[PDB]
Design a protein around this ligand. Structure first.
Ligand code: CDL
Ligand code: ZMP
Ligand code: SF4
Ligand code: SF4
Ligand code: ZN
Lengths: 49, 113, 208, 96, 43, 95, 114, 52, 176, 52
């Protein structure tokens, strides 16, 4: 079943932001929860993915 | 063969196109005989009307008459014959073969100024 | 002169010259000039009494059939005593061709309205009333079409300034958009650009 | 692209079309944002010889309009051009 | 010289016509299915 | 190389500063006067004079097509260096 | 000196058209003050009508006064039909404009204009 | 270069809003056809006239 | 070379007439349209997450104006007024004089950003790459006169955006 | 429509008012990789017309 792989991708998006706290952090700031490869961080704290 | 549509909206199919073109061309020549002979409009319109009337008298087929009158559908050829008739009736009342009504001013068409 | 020069079309030039002779000899009462440009466009300069006889002819003659009015234009040339140049642009779909019928008027001489020939003209020469002040007699509904309803003057005259004479602002005292004499915070900077050297010796005018 | 095959089959059935062969969202198939540096060609007037400007002066070959008739036989009636040739119906898809 | 150009064989063919793929049952079959549902409901 | 008027207002690289009795300082009240603090006349004077062995040098500003149009500076005067009219880089004949 | 007329052969027919236009404006002014709900009186709008007619009273050319009657009828047609708003009707009354200096002395005081 | 691209011209039959709609949809079709012919037949060379 | 849109005479046999009557009564094309809308319901939308995701641009993009400098600190603008001569909206106002070291430099370089039509004729008229129309488009103001740039604001925009402007010019100067 | 405005912006720098076609030719040559993306657009646009 491929719905299970969808839900496992959602659970590892929760894991990919460092748990539920960072998950809700990016959910309420970005309105978006998907994880990416961290390309970099500038001298201000902006992170690029 | 009874063409079903001319393709043009508002331009209905003519049932008997040859008789209509003969009546329109002879009526054009009737109106056009009332113009003086030194008027170039009379000479040119008699010339092209005689060409069109001879082509209509020399072709029974509607399609081949369309291809050698060279004016598209036969119904817009009929419409152009009616337009030429109305034009000749207006050109009688205008009398535009006369000399120029007035010379332009001296630098009226000088471009650039 | 192959790559960068526009290639001259001699067949269309010959055909438009011949048709210009044709129009000039069918209608000698009104036709004043006939000319063909080097880029092969035919201009028929006529007297303004023959707006209706010429344009009907080109609309209705079997060798003209200019059934389309593309554009109708005025041009203000103030050094001419008939300063307005009314330009008709006609399209024959039958003969795949374009003709230009030019005529003249000043501020006080009415041009006859060509709405009975081409209904297309109904707004166009109405624009010529709004922009230039050329009056068209026997027009169905002649009024302004583009300027504001209280507008004074005719803007596309060349003695009319680029900005107007009035400008609008909202005024809170009268609770109303109001018109006031125009002031610009930056004046439009006039640039004198014309070179003091002659560019085209083929267009050299003879001296006095 | 990240849609599962059940939603993809439902979507293709409801549209009646194969929607994965032609996605309206763009992916790796589009061009790179960084390109190699170009090397543009020069025109036909980049010659060191036989390249006088008067032999290719377009603006100075324009003449004033030829005044055909000015107001200071059995000659054939003419038209402004030959009459337009009738358009042919499409061989590609005439809807006929 | 290096310039934005089509590739060596040119681009592949591009669809440009109507494709409305004619799906669904016939009129006979659709009226038969609807009348069969009516008969099932009436029974 | 910015400096300051006695009103406390920064003087631009042009030299513009409002007077004390000029009312138009009221536009910066509660806000700021924006000046650029990298004065180009002080920055081009930091560039060292280029010693060259020729009599005429060419200058395009550096970068080739990214600089200015290539001009040719004569260096016969030993009293004065030869300055680029576009970029301000100055040159000296080393002999 | 022989020109083509517009409507009027001479100044008598022209003054007749001027007179009919003044009649039509005089009849229209109370309806204009009502339906635009202007803050002026019918006497004041009719005085503005009289001012706009007497501004052009120096003209002795029949074609010019023909075109003035044409443009006055266009103004009236744009007023009867509600094509103007209240703003376009009140642009005849230069209310927000400060009064210009009329004598030599105050024009000398305010600036360089003659 | 429209004498060198090949395309069809949608002609209506009733003069209504619907045939003008179908003409604009088919002109989108034929514009895609012209775009394919322009992409395949794009020549090399300069892009301004070489009169400076 | 032409085609006839909508010139199909429909078949009048009982098969096709019953097909059209089933379409009329049973609403087949309406279900077709509902199916196409349902097919977009399960597609991924095309919505990027602004401000965190940005629309794609190119190095030719014409945004906020900037005055540039040489790689020595000297400003490139040598007061030639070509940008304000070519300016189709007359947004640029330039006054110049020789400064204290005799260089031809401006003392007024104004761009009214509310006259500007953002067509970049100034940066292609400029013979030294001094004025550019840079990459910034997110510079909306709360006041009208904050868009009336003087020379200080344009030089500060150049100092602010030069690291991006120079790389965009490095990407695009071979097309120019 | 948005992707074609990206085509305008890649060829001129503006999404709508390009000032790109000029008397004499066009202002600037096509950037490298533009015609491939116009091909990738044209390959899919017929299905967009089909669902319209
Ligand atoms: C029917 C009821 C819903 C059942 C769940 C469902 O269909 O999920 C969509 C799931 C994935 O669909 P898809 O669009 O092909 O997946 C592409 C995703 O972009 C690929 O998935 P992804 O990589 O984007 O995964 C991330 C996603 C993971 O996706 C989910 O968590 C799916 C939603 C579960 C609810 O998680 C999130 O985005 C977080 C969403 C949290 C809120 C979800 C809504 C909660 C509603 C109740 C409160 O659909 C299926 O697997 C087919 C339908 C199966 C139905 C089985 C019977 C019930
Ligand atoms: C709310 C505001 C309403 C604004 C209304 C604007 C309408 C303006 C229409 C203007 C039309 C004219 O001015 S036509 C007048 C031109 N007539 C002349 O130049 C001939 C001289 N006319 C006169 O002297 C006129 O007073 C008379 C009444 C014709 C004759 O008077 P005299 O005799 O003693
Ligand atoms: S982008 Fe165009 S309108 Fe704006 S300042 Fe430059 S030349 Fe003027
Ligand atoms: S910005 Fe460029 S074009 Fe404008 S005055 Fe300065 S050097 Fe000349
Ligand atoms: Zn230099």
């Amino acid at each position: 079943m491929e719905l299970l792989q969808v839900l496992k991708r959602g659970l590892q998006q929760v894991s990919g932001h460092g748990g539920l706290r960072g998950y809700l952090r990016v959910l309420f700031r970005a309105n978006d929860v998907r994880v990416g490869t961290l390309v970099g961080e500038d001298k201000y704290g902006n992170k690029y993915y | 063969l009874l063409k079903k549509t001319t393709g043009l909206v508002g331009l209905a199919v003519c049932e008997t196109p040859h008789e209509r073109l003969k009546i329109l061309y002879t009526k054009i020549l009737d109106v056009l005989g009332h113009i003086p002979k030194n008027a170039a409009y009379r000479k040119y319109t008699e010339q092209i009307t005689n060409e069109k009337l001879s082509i209509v008298k020399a072709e029974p087929d509607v399609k081949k008459l369309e291809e050698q009158l060279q004016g598209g559908q036969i119904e817009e050829v009929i419409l152009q014959a009616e337009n030429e008739l109305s034009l000749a009736r207006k050109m009688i009342q205008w009398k535009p073969w006369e000399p120029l009504v007035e010379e332009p001013p001296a630098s009226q068409w000088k471009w650039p100024i | 002169t192959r790559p960068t020069v526009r290639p001259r079309n001699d067949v269309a030039h010959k055909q438009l010259s011949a048709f210009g002779e044709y129009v000039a000899e069918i209608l000698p009462k009104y036709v004043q000039q006939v000319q063909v440009s080097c880029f092969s466009e035919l201009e028929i300069c006529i007297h303004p009494d023959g707006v209706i006889p010429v344009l009907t002819f080109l609309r209705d003659h079997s060798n003209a059939q200019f059934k389309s009015l593309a554009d109708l234009t005025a041009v203000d040339i103030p050094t001419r005593q008939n300063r307005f140049e009314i330009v008709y642009n006609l399209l024959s779909l039958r003969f795949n061709s374009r003709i230009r019928v030019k005529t003249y008027t000043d501020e006080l001489t009415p041009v006859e309205s060509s709405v009975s020939v081409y209904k297309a003209a109904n707004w166009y020469e109405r624009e010529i009333w709004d922009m230039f002040g050329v009056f068209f007699a026997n027009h169905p509904d002649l009024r302004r079409i583009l300027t504001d309803y209280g507008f004074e003057g005719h803007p596309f005259r060349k003695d009319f300034p680029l900005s107007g004479y009035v400008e609008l602002r909202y005024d809170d005292e009268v609770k109303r958009v109001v018109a006031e004499p125009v002031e610009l915070a930056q004046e439009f900077r006039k640039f004198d650009l014309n070179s003091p050297w002659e560019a085209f010796p083929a267009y050299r005018q003879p001296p006095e | 692209a990240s849609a599962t095959r059940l939603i993809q089959g439902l979507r293709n059935w409801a549209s009646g079309r194969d929607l994965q062969a032609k996605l309206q969202l763009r992916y790796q198939e589009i061009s790179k944002r960084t390109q190699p540096p170009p090397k543009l060609p020069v025109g036909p007037s980049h010659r060191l010889s036989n390249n006088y400007y008067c032999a290719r002066d377009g603006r100075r070959e324009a003449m004033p309009p030829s005044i055909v008739m000015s107001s200071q036989s059995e000659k054939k009636a003419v038209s402004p051009a030959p009459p337009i040739k009738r358009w042919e119906l499409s061989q590609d898809e005439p809807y006929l | 010289v290096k310039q934005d150009m089509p590739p060596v064989g040119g681009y592949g063919p591009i669809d440009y016509k109507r494709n409305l793929p004619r799906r669904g049952l016939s009129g006979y079959s659709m009226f038969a299915v609807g009348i069969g549902a009516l008969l099932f409901g009436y029974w | 190389g910015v400096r300051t008027s006695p009103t406390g207002e920064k003087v631009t690289h042009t030299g513009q500063v409002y007077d004390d009795e000029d009312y138009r300082r009221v536009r910066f009240v509660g806000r700021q006067k924006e000046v650029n603090e990298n004065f180009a006349i002080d920055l081009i004077a930091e560039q060292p004079v280029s010693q060259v062995g020729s009599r005429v040098i060419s200058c395009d500003g550096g970068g080739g097509a990214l600089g200015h149009p290539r001009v040719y500076i004569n260096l016969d005067k030993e009293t004065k260096t030869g300055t680029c009219g576009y970029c301000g880089l100055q040159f000296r004949q080393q002999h | 000196t022989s020109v083509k007329p517009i409507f009027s052969r001479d100044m008598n027919e022209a003054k007749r058209r001027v007179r009919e236009l003044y009649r039509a404006w005089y009849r229209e002014v109370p309806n204009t003050v009502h339906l635009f709900q202007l803050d002026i009186s019918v006497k004041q709008g009719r005085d503005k009508v009289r001012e706009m007619f007497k501004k052009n009273a120096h003209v002795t050319d029949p074609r010019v006064v023909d075109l003035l009657v044409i443009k006055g009828k266009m103004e009236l047609e744009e007023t009867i039909n509600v094509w103007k708003q209240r703003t376009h009707v009140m642009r005849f009354f230069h209310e927000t404009e400060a009064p210009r200096p009329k004598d030599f002395l105050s024009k000398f005081y305010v600036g360089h204009d003659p | 270069v429209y004498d060198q691209v090949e395309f069809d011209v949608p002609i209506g039959s009733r003069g209504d809003c619907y045939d003008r709609y179908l003409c604009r949809v088919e002109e989108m079709r034929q514009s895609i056809r012209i775009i394919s012919q322009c992409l395949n037949k794009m020549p090399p060379g300069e892009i301004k006239v070489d009169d400076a | 070379t032409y085609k006839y849109v909508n010139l199909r005479e429909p078949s009048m046999d009982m098969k096709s007439v019953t097909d059209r009557a089933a379409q009329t009564l049973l609403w087949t094309e309406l279900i077709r349209g509902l199916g196409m809308t349902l097919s977009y319901l399960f597609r991924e939308p095309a919505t990027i997450n602004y401000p965190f995701e940005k629309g794609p641009l190119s190095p030719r993009f014409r945004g906020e104006h900037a005055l540039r400098r040489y790689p020595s600190g000297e400003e490139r603008c040598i007061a030639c007024k070509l940008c304000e001569a070519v300016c189709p909206a007359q947004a640029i106002t330039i006054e110049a004089e020789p400064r204290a070291d005799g260089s031809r430099r401006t003392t007024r370089y104004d761009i009214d950003m509310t006259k500007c039509i953002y067509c970049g004729f100034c940066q292609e008229a400029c013979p030294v790459d001094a004025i550019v129309e840079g990459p910034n488009f997110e510079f909306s103001t709360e006041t009208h006169e904050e868009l009336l740039y003087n020379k200080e604001k344009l030089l500060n925009n150049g100092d602010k955006w030069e690291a991006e402007i120079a790389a965009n010019i490095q990407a695009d100067y071979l097309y120019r | 429509r948005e992707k074609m405005f990206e085509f305008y912006e890649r060829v001129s720098g503006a999404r709508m008012h390009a000032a790109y076609v000029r008397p004499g030719g066009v202002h600037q040559d096509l950037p490298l990789g533009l015609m491939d993306d116009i091909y990738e657009f044209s390959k899919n646009f017929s299905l967009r017309i089909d669902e319209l």
